[PDB]
Amino acid sequence: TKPLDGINVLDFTHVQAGPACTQMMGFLGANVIKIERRGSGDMTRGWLQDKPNVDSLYFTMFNCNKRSIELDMKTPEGKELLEQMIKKADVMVENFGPGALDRMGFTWEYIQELNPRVILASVKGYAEGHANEHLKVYENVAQCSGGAAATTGFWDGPPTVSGAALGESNSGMHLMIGILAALEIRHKTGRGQKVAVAMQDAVLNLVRIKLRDQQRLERTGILAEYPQAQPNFAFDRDGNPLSFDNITSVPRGGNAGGGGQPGWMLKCKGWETDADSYVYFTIAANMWPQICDMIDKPEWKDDPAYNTFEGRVDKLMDIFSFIETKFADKDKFEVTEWAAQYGIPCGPVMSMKELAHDPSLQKVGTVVEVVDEIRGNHLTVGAPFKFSGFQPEITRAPLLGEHTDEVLKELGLDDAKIKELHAKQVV
Amino acid sequence: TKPLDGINVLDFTHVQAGPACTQMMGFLGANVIKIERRGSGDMTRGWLQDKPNVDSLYFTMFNCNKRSIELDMKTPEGKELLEQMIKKADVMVENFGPGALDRMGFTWEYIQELNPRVILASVKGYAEGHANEHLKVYENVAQCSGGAAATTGFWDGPPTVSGAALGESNSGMHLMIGILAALEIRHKTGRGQKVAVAMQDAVLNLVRIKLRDQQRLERTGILAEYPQAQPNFAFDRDGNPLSFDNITSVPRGGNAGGGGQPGWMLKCKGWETDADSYVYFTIAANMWPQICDMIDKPEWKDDPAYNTFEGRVDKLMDIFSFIETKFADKDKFEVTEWAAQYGIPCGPVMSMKELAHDPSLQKVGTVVEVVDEIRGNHLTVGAPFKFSGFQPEITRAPLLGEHTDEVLKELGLDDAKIKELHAKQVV
Ligand SMILES: CC(C)(COP(=O)(O)OP(=O)(O)OC[C@H]1O[C@@H](n2cnc3c(N)ncnc32)[C@H](O)[C@@H]1OP(=O)(O)O)[C@@H](O)C(=O)NCCC(=O)NCCS
Ligand SMILES: CC(C)(COP(=O)(O)OP(=O)(O)OC[C@H]1O[C@@H](n2cnc3c(N)ncnc32)[C@H](O)[C@@H]1OP(=O)(O)O)[C@@H](O)C(=O)NCCC(=O)NCCS
């Protein structure tokens, strides 16, 4: 049974945040109708195409399980069609610029009038009421606005963006929670709501641990687990010691633990020609005895200045450079095995080539081969939530306006009226 | 009113992913009962305490809108209590080791007998059926497993962890989608399901954009939007040149645009001294004339070496370098306002200090002061989704076992039976 079987989604989205949300609703069984610009459609179609005149992978990987209709909404008749579509919809999703949908006349107040059951769901860069409410935002702008960039990277480098789509897809996933929450509200009230997710807010929610850190820092002057609190280890630009003397905002800690336990990122065989031949190594509180076995160093058991958290930070990074020579003659996976006999959260850095073709991930339906007979098959990420009673069936992305007529006929429009809308350049 | 009003959650979780998920359900009105170990409780209580004897900000910021019972599940009397609680619950959420709830005599199969309505939701490190199914994993190991570390950072540095909790909180937010999807299945079938989110999978979902890049790289040999595509721009740590001639796995791209339009992290006034004195500036394809106006390069408007994306591939990092030059005497807010005039996607790197005291974020309920009379007030991140007909009411995290007797009394137990359980050391 598919969770969102029977849910009609009127999908006005483009780029990533919005499309990611409705695609995933589609994977869970929603009937998604993507509305697009005439001629060029969603800007992802033409964005970094790998073949001329063929929809890009940006588009196909975010628009499976959708049908497409073209529509000029800057048109009297196009507005009319939208009203009809809103009357059949359970949820309408949009991620156009601030005020864009309002300017077309589709304010929340008006949408409620058209259909008291419909949920409007929107992604914006900043929350409504925010000073930067009206700004247009892509991915890394939101990473910066939400605290992630400031706390990511090294103490002697710039704010650093995550390769993960903290701004875009992460927002779409948060919107999905909001929409689903709203559907649960509606079971109770019989009424739709507006839900919105700001990209800044979705990023900040993942950066909660760093707001923890900010308060700890404000209250105590120190973050004891951060590299900067370890004696003459971190150094700034000029050959100087760093410390928390003179740091009042959570700093970048390179490859330290974050919201997990303390660890570091360690080189393995072939690192010079293989950018991803590394493991990460968590040295936690719960499992310190089990860690001292692979290092063939039992001297750290009796020592009070090694086996406690507070009696360990003073030389936290000395322990890490130790092992990096001990991993020097072993690949990622062999280093991982060599230690994993002990129940240590220790893992390889997986490369995109390894993940894309990993048999495990394809077996569990997390990386999925989409059968696309028009364009040729491509991989995608499937549903990251696995259910005992249901499996997603992922189905190729629509050609531009491929379902236009089929959608217009479902609305009750006759064959002659369909030709008029075509010739008036509305569809 | 509230989305999850009337939903009872049996919350066995600890640390981050699981507690983030049940806290957010709590913020949306769920009745959340956190089951904790006698004596110690959730390990976050004692981790990174800012005052000793007082529950850490790690715990309070992940455990608002919850009640706490102490319960030794290993005793037989604690198992019969669990059976009564399961029969009243709509959802059970656990992390623990990959097969820990099963060991305790509460397998999915048994749970269904007790309550055919209940949803069992789990966070694990890797998906069931994966080779690494059995592994314990923390934040940074999960980032490594899901492709984020490989594609985050710079081409001349190591895989870099993201400060955002891609593995932990991100997994809990994905599980919440999962739980809410399962609650919608249940409206249709009257039956609960098992839902599970592997941390690797939640990470990979956000790294979907990089699986797009991996395929583009395999198909075409080049990622034209990456710095490495500029001839003679990028070099490894030993000074060897880095081009796409030799790259077979999606590389680290520094502060390139991701799923956004091309951009970079540019220095503003004070950057040598202020770690966060930067903006993200986007060079979108539709905005070249405007950029040329902003930086006074009218000669670049009609020049094909500059006026398309394709023409900029060989020189984009040089254009960013020159743009940056215009910001040397302006702070990040002045640069943002200046770029806003032109409609350019551009914002500041907000520091955690700035975010913690930002008036906009408090006004919209995204940074919230929690009233906590026991520990003193603290900030937290509130609900990142804003609704037209409901507001969260965030209440302080429970003291260990604060609500044990209150909870045993809602089950129906009388004063004498609760007296005996305290004596037996079950609760
Ligand atoms: C991504 C973003 C920056 C791109 O902005 P953009 O390319 O300038 O396009 P916009 O969304 O602002 O749309 C431009 C106009 O086209 C209009 N439009 C969109 N589809 C149309 C169609 N089918 N027919 C007629 N007009 C249409 C919009 O209503 C808007 O009108 P306006 O001039 O009244 O504002 C912007 O859409 C945005 O800030 N989105 C919100 C946050 C977000 O999701 N961004 C990350 C990308 S997923
Ligand atoms: C985070 C993690 C690595 C911590 O692991 P840990 O420190 O080794 O603790 P565990 O979860 O393995 O629990 C240890 C044992 O205590 C038991 N236990 C937990 N609560 C108990 C209680 N209240 N009373 C009695 N026993 C209890 C567990 O059942 C487990 O039993 P086991 O030895 O048979 O496996 C692990 O819980 C995990 O990988 N979680 C799943 C995914 C996840 O959320 N991880 C990221 C952390 S948020």
DSSP string across A237-293: SSS-B--STT--SPPP-TTS-TTS-SEEEEE-TTTTT-TT-EEEEE--STTHHHHTT
- In chain B, the residue whose alpha carbon lies closest to the alpha carbon of A142 is B347
Ligand 1 centroid – CA A15 distance (Å): 10
Residues A209, B183: C-beta atoms closer than 8 Å:
no
Whether B19 is in the pocket of ligand 2, judged by its Cβ within 6 Å, is no
Angstrom CA distances, B305 to B282, B314, B397, stand at: 18, 9, 59
Look up tokens 């941390």; give the residue.
B199
**Residue A178 structure tokens:** 């909001």
* CA pair distance B281, B256, nearest whole angstrom: 10
**Residue B259 structure tokens:** 């799923």
Ligand number with the minimum distance to the CA of A16 = 1
Identify whether residues A266 and A402 lie together within a single domain. Answer: no
Long-range contacts from A417-423, C-beta under 8 angstroms, 24+ separation: A421/A77, A421/A81
For residue B349, give the nearest of A24, A144, A353 by CB distance.
Answer: A144
Most informative mutation of A136, A138, A404 for ligand 1 (most atoms within 8 A of CB): A136
Whether B134 is in the pocket of ligand 2, judged by its Cβ within 6 Å, is no
Contact A40, A55 (CB under 8 A): no
Judging by DSSP bridges, how do beta strands B263-267 and B278-282 pair with one another? antiparallel
Closest CA to B218 of A351, A305, A188: A351
Whether A345 is in the pocket of ligand 2, judged by its Cβ within 6 Å, is yes
Distance of CA A96 to the CA centre of its chain: 18
Interface of B with A in 242-301 (CB under 8 A): 248-261, 263, 265, 267, 272, 275-276, 278-280, 282, 284
Interface of B with A in 84-103 (CB under 8 A): none
Contact A343, A287 (CB under 8 A): yes
Identify whether residues A191 and A329 lie together within a single domain. Answer: no
Q: Give the gap in angstroms from C-alpha B296 to the nearest C-alpha of chain A.
A: 23
* CA pair distance B22, B398, nearest whole angstrom: 14
Judging by DSSP bridges, how do beta strands A119-124 and A194-198 pair with one another? parallel
The domain boundary, picked from A319, A350, A381, lies at: A350
Torsion of CA B62, B67, B72, B73, to 10 degrees: -80
Angstrom CA distances, A66 to A21, A396, B89, B168, stand at: 12, 8, 36, 30
Look up tokens 């003291």; give the residue.
B399
Cβ-based neighbours of A238, under 8 Å, separated by 6 or more? none
**Residue A34 structure tokens:** 């993507």
Atom of ligand 1 nearest to the CA of A72: 24
Contact A63, A34 (CB under 8 A): yes
Identify whether residues B346 and B372 lie together within a single domain. Answer: no
For residue B165, give the nearest of A174, A206, A381 by CB distance.
Answer: A206
* CA pair distance B352, B358, nearest whole angstrom: 10
Identify whether residues B145 and B178 lie together within a single domain. Answer: yes
Helix axes A169-189, B199-206, angle to 10 degrees: 110
* CA pair distance B244, A200, nearest whole angstrom: 33
Resolution of this deposited model, Å: 2.1
What phi and psi values does residue A22 have, to the nearest 5 degrees? -75, -30
Judging by DSSP bridges, how do beta strands B346-348 and A31-36 pair with one another? unpaired
* CA pair distance A254, B123, nearest whole angstrom: 27
Which sign, positive or negative, has the C-alpha torsion B413, B417, B420, B426?
negative
Cβ-based neighbours of A241, under 8 Å, separated by 6 or more? A232, A234, A235
In the three-class reduction of DSSP (H, G, I as helix; E, B as strand; rest coil), residue A228 is classed as helix
Identify whether residues A241 and A271 lie together within a single domain. Answer: no
Contact A162, B164 (CB under 8 A): yes
- Best mutation target among A4, A22, A90, A177 (most B Cβ atoms within 10 Å) is A177
Question: What's the domain count of chain A?
Answer: 2
Identify whether residues A53 and A160 lie together within a single domain. Answer: yes
DSSP class of A190 = S
Closest CA to A410 of A33, A44, A136, A124: A33
CATH number for the domain that contains residue A410? 3.40.50.10540
Q: Give the gap in angstroms from C-alpha B216 to the nearest C-alpha of chain A.
A: 6
Helix axes B169-189, B17-27, angle to 10 degrees: 60
Atom of ligand 2 nearest to the CA of B135: 39
**A401 in reach of chain B (CB within 8 A):** no
Closest CA to B251 of A276, A262, A343: A276
Most informative mutation of B136, B169, B400 for ligand 2 (most atoms within 8 A of CB): B136
What phi and psi values does residue A104 have, to the nearest 5 degrees? -70, -10
Ligand 2 centroid – CA A26 distance (Å): 34
Contact A15, B212 (CB under 8 A): no
Residues B249, A348: C-beta atoms closer than 8 Å:
no
Domain that holds residue B39: 1-253+351-427
* B38 phi-psi bin (left φ>0, alpha ψ -120 to 50, beta other): beta
State the Rg of chain B over Cα.
26
Identify whether residues A59 and A180 lie together within a single domain. Answer: yes
What phi and psi values does residue B251 have, to the nearest 5 degrees? -90, 170
Residues B384, A170: C-beta atoms closer than 8 Å:
no
Helix (H) or strand (E) holding B201: helix B199-206
Residues B185, A145: C-beta atoms closer than 8 Å:
no
Nearest CA residue ID for atom 24, ligand 2 = B72
**Residue B247 structure tokens:** 């790259």
Identify whether residues B163 and B288 lie together within a single domain. Answer: no
Contact B292, B301 (CB under 8 A): yes
**Residue A130 structure tokens:** 């925010």
Residues B166, A163: C-beta atoms closer than 8 Å:
no
Helix axes A169-189, A199-206, angle to 10 degrees: 100
- In chain B, the residue whose alpha carbon lies closest to the alpha carbon of A2 is B185
Amino acid at B57: L
Nearest CA residue ID for atom 5, ligand 1 = A97
Identify whether residues B3 and B19 lie together within a single domain. Answer: yes
The domain boundary, picked from A350, A385, A400, lies at: A350
Whether A137 is in the pocket of ligand 1, judged by its Cβ within 6 Å, is yes
Q: Chain A residues with CB inside 8 Å of B136's CB?
A: 343-345
Ligand number with the minimum distance to the CA of B260 = 1
Residues A351, B150: C-beta atoms closer than 8 Å:
yes
Judging by DSSP bridges, how do beta strands B194-198 and A385-387 pair with one another? antiparallel
Amino acid at A226: Y
Whether A401 is in the pocket of ligand 1, judged by its Cβ within 6 Å, is no
The domain boundary, picked from A311, A331, A350, lies at: A350
Q: Chain A residues with CB inside 8 Å of B204's CB?
A: 355, 361, 366-367, 381, 384
Contact B201, B208 (CB under 8 A): no
Amino acid at A300: W
Identify whether residues A346 and A396 lie together within a single domain. Answer: no
Judging by DSSP bridges, how do beta strands B278-282 and A194-198 pair with one another? unpaired
- Method of determination is X-ray
CATH number for the domain that contains residue A261? 3.30.1540.10
Nearest CA residue ID for atom 11, ligand 2 = B96
Count residue pairs from A and B with Cβ separation < 8 A: 559
Atom of ligand 1 nearest to the CA of A36: 23
Contact B55, B83 (CB under 8 A): no
Torsion of CA B198, B204, B206, B208, to 10 degrees: -150
Identify whether residues A95 and A193 lie together within a single domain. Answer: yes
- For the residues of A115-159, what is the DSSP string, one character each? -TTPEEEEEESS-TTSTTTT----HHHHHHHTTTGGGSS-TTS--
Identify whether residues B123 and B260 lie together within a single domain. Answer: no
Q: Residue A109, CB half-sphere, CA atoms under 13 Å: how many?
A: 3
Residues A180, B181: C-beta atoms closer than 8 Å:
yes
* CA pair distance B112, A158, nearest whole angstrom: 52
**Residue A414 structure tokens:** 């006759």
Ligand 2 centroid – CA B93 distance (Å): 13
Atom of ligand 2 nearest to the CA of B137: 39
Closest CA to B396 of B375, B372, B376, B374: B372
Whether A134 is in the pocket of ligand 1, judged by its Cβ within 6 Å, is no
Contact B207, B171 (CB under 8 A): no
Interface of A with B in 307-336 (CB under 8 A): none
Contact A42, A32 (CB under 8 A): no
Whether A18 is in the pocket of ligand 1, judged by its Cβ within 6 Å, is yes
Cβ-based neighbours of A55, under 8 Å, separated by 6 or more? A45, A49, A375, A397, A399, A400
- In chain A, the residue whose alpha carbon lies closest to the alpha carbon of B143 is A349
What phi and psi values does residue B16 have, to the nearest 5 degrees? -125, -60
* CA pair distance A224, A216, nearest whole angstrom: 10
- Best mutation target among A183, A388, A390 (most B Cβ atoms within 10 Å) is A388
* CA pair distance A85, B371, nearest whole angstrom: 45
Instruction: Work out the burial of residue A89: count CB atoms within 10 Å of its CB; fewer than 13 is exposed, 13-18 middle, 19 or more buried.
Output: buried
Q: Residue A151, CB half-sphere, CA atoms under 13 Å: how many?
A: 34
B387 beta partners: A195, B390
Cβ-based neighbours of A425, under 8 Å, separated by 6 or more? A38, A72, A75
Closest CA to A400 of A85, A64, A67: A67
- Scanning B88-149, the segments in alpha helix (DSSP H) are 100-103, 108-114, 139-145
The 10 Å CB-count burial string (b at 16+, else e) for B307-339 is: bebeebbebbbebbeebbeebeebebeebbebb
For residue A216, give the nearest of B50, B202, B206 by CB distance.
Answer: B50
